[PDB]
Amino acid sequence: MNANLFARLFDKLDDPHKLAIETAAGDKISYAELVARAGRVANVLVARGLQVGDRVAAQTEKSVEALVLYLATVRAGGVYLPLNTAYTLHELDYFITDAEPKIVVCDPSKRDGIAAIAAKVGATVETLGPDGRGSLTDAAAGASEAFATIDRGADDLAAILYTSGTTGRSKGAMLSHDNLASNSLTLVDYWRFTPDDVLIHALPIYHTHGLFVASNVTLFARGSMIFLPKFDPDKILDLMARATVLMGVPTFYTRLLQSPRLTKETTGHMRLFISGSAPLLADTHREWSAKTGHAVLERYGMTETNMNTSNPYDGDRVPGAVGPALPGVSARVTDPETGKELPRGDIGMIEVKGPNVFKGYWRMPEKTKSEFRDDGFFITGDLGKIDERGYVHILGRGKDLVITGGFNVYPKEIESEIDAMPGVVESAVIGVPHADFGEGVTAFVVLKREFAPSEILAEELKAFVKDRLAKFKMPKKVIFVDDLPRNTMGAVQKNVLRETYKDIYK
Ligand SMILES: Nc1ncnc2c1ncn2[C@@H]1O[C@H](COP(=O)(O)OP(=O)(O)OP(=O)(O)O)[C@@H](O)[C@H]1O
Numbered sequence: 001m002n003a004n005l006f007a008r009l010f011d012k013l014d015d016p017h018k019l020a021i022e023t024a025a026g027d028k029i030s031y032a033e034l035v036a037r038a039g040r041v042a043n044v045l046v047a048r049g050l051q052v053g054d055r056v057a058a059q060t061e062k063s064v065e066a067l068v069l070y071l072a073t074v075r076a077g078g079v080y081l082p083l084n085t086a087y088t089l090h091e092l093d094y095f096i097t098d099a100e101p102k103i104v105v106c107d108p109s110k111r112d113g114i115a116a117i118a119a120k121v122g123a124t125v126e127t128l129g130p131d132g133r134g135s136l137t138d139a140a141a142g143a144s145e146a147f148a149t150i151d152r153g154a155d156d157l158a159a160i161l162y163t164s165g166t167t168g169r170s171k172g173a174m175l176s177h178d179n180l181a182s183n184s185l186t187l188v189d190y191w192r193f194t195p196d197d198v199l200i201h202a203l204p205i206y207h208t209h210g211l212f213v214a215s216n217v218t219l220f221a222r223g224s225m226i227f228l229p230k231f232d233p234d235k236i237l238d239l240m241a242r243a244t245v246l247m248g249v250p251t252f253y254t255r256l257l258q259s260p261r262l263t264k265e266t267t268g269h270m271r272l273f274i275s276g277s278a279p280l281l282a283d284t285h286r287e288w289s290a291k292t293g294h295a296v297l298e299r300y301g302m303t304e305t306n307m308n309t310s311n312p313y314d315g316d317r318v319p320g321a322v323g324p325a326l327p328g329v330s331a332r333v334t335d336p337e338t339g340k341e342l343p344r345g346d347i348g349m350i351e352v353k354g355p356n357v358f359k360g361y362w363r364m365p366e367k368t369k370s371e372f373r374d375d376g377f378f379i380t381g382d383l384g385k386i387d388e389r390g391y392v393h394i395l396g397r398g399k400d401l402v403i404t405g406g407f408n409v410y411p412k413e414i415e416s417e418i419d420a421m422p423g424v425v426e427s428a429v430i431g432v433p434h435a436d437f438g439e440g441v442t443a444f445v446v447l448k449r450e451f452a453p454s455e456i457l458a459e460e461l462k463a464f465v466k467d468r469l470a471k472f473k474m475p476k477k478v479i480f481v482d483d484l485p486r487n488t489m490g491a492v493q494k495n496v497l498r499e500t501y502k503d504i505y506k
């Protein structure tokens with residue numbers, strides 16, 4: 001009855017020699033071998049001073065060795081804290097000071113700098129490079145495989161993951177053993193994962209999608225994964241002939257649609273394509289079906305809540321919707337101000353409750369207090385509606401709402417009209433300070449190669465818009481850009497645009 005996530009995963013192993021992970025080089029690691037690696041590393045953590053409840057902070061390139069570190073930390077009763085690989089030394093300083101880890105694991109090339117940051121909280125530093133070598137690996141080589149998995153309760157912490165930083169400075173989400181186990185167990189059944197599944201794993205592992213959804217679902221299912229260091233469209237296309245599942249973000253799908261190799265024939269061995277972590281546009285969903293004949297299954301989750309909703313595996317997968325609430329999860333829509341539930345179909349604040357919902361923000365009990373309703377529902381910060389069939393539709397983030405001359409403007413519906421114009425790849429709509437209207441609706445528009453940006457084209461876009469947008473929804477300015485700013489996970493970073501273009505109306 002140990003709730004420890006590692007114990008749930010591995011204490012009963014009825015097929016130990018089954019493949020768990022194939023590495024980028026083609027080496028194959030069984031379940032038993034993965035478990036024994038985790039034992040070695042758990043013993044290393046204890047030898048480097050880990051006590052139960054301590055954080056282990058990890059900034060490394062992706063490798064099976066890094067995945068093992070996650071499993072070992074959890075196994076040893078520690079609290080695993082992965083960190084964006086792209087964070088600079090100064091950026092990293094905040095997270096280490098916030099979390100106060102006992103152990104920091106970093107790239108060998110960053111050791112001297114990170115050791116200084118580590119000294120402030122008295123942390124021991126080990127290294128792990130892109131090839132899986134380093135001081136962590138040296139210590140693990142002579143360590144014992146046997147390890148008594150630490151007894152943990154359902155509500156004890158297994159991880160702290162920092163949010164992506166999209167709306168503001170990243171917050172540390174305290175995730176329990178039951179949060180992670182309950183969610184992945186539900187998804188194994190909901191997505192019909194079996195031991196025959198082979199997951200193409202091309203997502204980073206400092207984020208909930210690549211770390212938990214991809215890994216835990218595969219491991220509970222007793223399937224395997226092909227563990228690639230990054231997204232590479234030609235490698236992914238090659239592997240589909242011998243894999244069954246891809247978990248991706250919308251940009252994976254938009255990129256793959258640009259390959260002339262993406263055909264029915266090339267994808268025909270595949271069981272399931274999943275999209276998550278950012279809005280999969282309805283037109284992309286339809287473009288994928290027209291080109292490949294597969295219907296992408298989209299799901300919606302957050303760092304704080306793991307997965308909340310999912311289009312059904314065996315039901316309608318609806319373009320532009322993120323599906324009903326998962327088994328065990330409750331989802332409702334409420335008036336942002338008052339907090340009362342709205343009728344089905346009305347746009348409001350999405351709130352969720354369930355064993356998937358985290359225990360709070362690390363060392364932010366006030367912020368935590370403000371984001372839970374008295375009845376325990378978590379305020380997502382995402383606006384949307386739930387239709388009559390129970391499917392959640394996400395209209396946009398609350399922070400992205402633009403208030404202009406007295407009117408609420410929802411940037412997704414403007415972006416959709418703009419994106420419909422031939423010549424437009426995609427658009428991002430924000431408000432920036434405006435002396436007349438308070439905030440001015442501003443459209444940032446990425447063009448196809450064949451089109452040149454001009455004031456004339458901007459007017460033609462506005463003319464196109466236009467009959468389909470209420471006067472008050474019309475952008476006060478159109479700005480052509482080479483590319484939208486995105487984070488390492490592919491999510492548009494509207495705060496980047498708000499800062500760069502803050503003075504356009506001055
Ligand atoms: N399928 C989806 N469709 C639309 N939006 C999605 C989907 N999946 C995730 N999201 C968005 O991503 C958010 C979760 O992202 P994440 O936990 O990575 O941190 P963030 O919200 O981007 O950053 P921060 O919380 O620091 O502002 C959700 O709250 C939602 O806004």
Ligand SMILES: [Mg+2]
Binds near residue numbers: 381
């Ligand atoms: Mg967020």
